[PDB]
Amino acid sequence: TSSVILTNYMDTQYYGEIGIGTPPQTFKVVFDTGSSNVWVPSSKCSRLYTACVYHKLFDASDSSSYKHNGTELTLRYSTGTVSGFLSQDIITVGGITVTQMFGEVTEMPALPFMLAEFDGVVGMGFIEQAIGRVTPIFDNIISQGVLKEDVFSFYYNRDSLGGQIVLGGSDPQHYEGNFHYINLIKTGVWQIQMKGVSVGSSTLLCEDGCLALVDTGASYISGSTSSIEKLMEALGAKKRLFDYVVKCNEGPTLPDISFHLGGKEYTLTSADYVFQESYSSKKLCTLAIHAMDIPPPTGPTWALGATFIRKFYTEFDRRNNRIGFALAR
Ligand SMILES: COc1ccccc1COCCCOc1ccc(N2C(=O)CNC[C@H]2COc2ccc3c(c2)NCCC3)cc1
Predict the structure, then answer these.
(1) Contact 278/289 with Cβ under 8 angstroms?
(2) Where is the Peptidase A1 domain?
(3) Where in the chain is the domain with CATH 2.40.70.10?
(4) How big is the CA angle at 184 (ends 179 and 186), to the nearest 5 degrees?
(5) Which atom of ligand 1 lies nearest, measured to the CA of 218?
(6) What residues line ligand 1, using a CB cutoff of 6 Å?
């Protein structure tokens, strides 16, 4: 077992540090169970790409261990199609060193990569969804047969450690009660069946069922715009330019949102999904939820991000293709 300390940036971004190359080129990265690739901006990334001007660039010509590949990797992020090329090098993750192939982004839109406090993504997803079919970092750690267990866990603190990922297990110090596991529907994705979503006292959503992407990478909880337009209106959520809000002084009265997974009800009190910046009546306060129309095969599917994870310590169990959730502590 190895644990990676995470920095919690305004409850929207939880990222850690990986070292890449010889010598180790440090990168602040989000460990994303929603993606299966390692992406870091390339030193080859044109200075024109703003996301690159203000971010740690990986310089291959600075690493003695670098193993060129060149294979161009691409992925459209409904904001722009980012592109880089495949590269190989030793990546250190919480004391664990692994030869890992990753993408160096050479081209990527400002939004939202420009606002990232971190420089890259450590895809924790499955290889089934790894662009270029590149073997994921954790699959690469598993291969080492050093981890005490084929699982990694997430602890996203409620700001102020900012968070904590445990490679190989889970930290009892960060959850309480017991893990209630939901199985992974389609294998190859950290997604589980969801028996509806409730609003205070009314199962008026996801009725009949729906899918939930347990995305450690997503800042918020999301679902099809339909579900969110429904949900947000049912809360009194008055939509803004993008995210929905609600008068601060009225955030504490908003009803409890619950997600049904594994025969257990996962409730988010209003203090769980509202960014209670203040309690004034004049200022508006945002909700840790938004509409994310995720495209198939995985989508449409709700996505339980940091908002969800913050309250429920999460465990991604590979060996058993299931996800554990326990009261984050
Ligand atoms: C980390 O993104 C970068 C930032 C600067 C420079 C280079 C990169 C990576 O290259 C870009 C190529 C790969 O880019 C992505 C990789 C993974 C994703 N995700 C998924 O596929 C599924 N779920 C969640 C996300 C991870 O969470 C994210 C990603 C970006 C942001 C936030 C959260 N939060 C706020 C700041 C931006 C999105 C984009």
Answers:
(1) no
(2) 14-326
(3) 1-170, 171-328
(4) 175
(5) 24
(6) 13, 30, 32, 34-35, 39, 41, 51, 55, 77, 82, 105, 108, 112-113, 115-116, 118-121, 215, 217-219
Annotated catalytic residue within 11, 139, 215, 272:
215
Report how far apart, in Å, the C-alpha atoms of 310 and of each of 48, 62, 87, 89, 200 are. 36, 37, 33, 32, 20
Active site residue 32: yes
Contact status, residue 291 vs residue 225, Cβ threshold 8 Å:
yes
Q: Is 215 a catalytic residue?
A: yes
How was this structure determined? It was done by X-ray
Distance 113 CA to ligand 1 centre (A): 7
Q: Which atom of ligand 1 is nearest to the CA of 303?
A: 23
Out of 3.40.228.10, 1.20.1250.20, 3.20.20.70, 2.40.70.10, the CATH code matching 171-328 is: 2.40.70.10
Terminus-to-terminus CA distance in the chain, angstroms?
Answer: 20
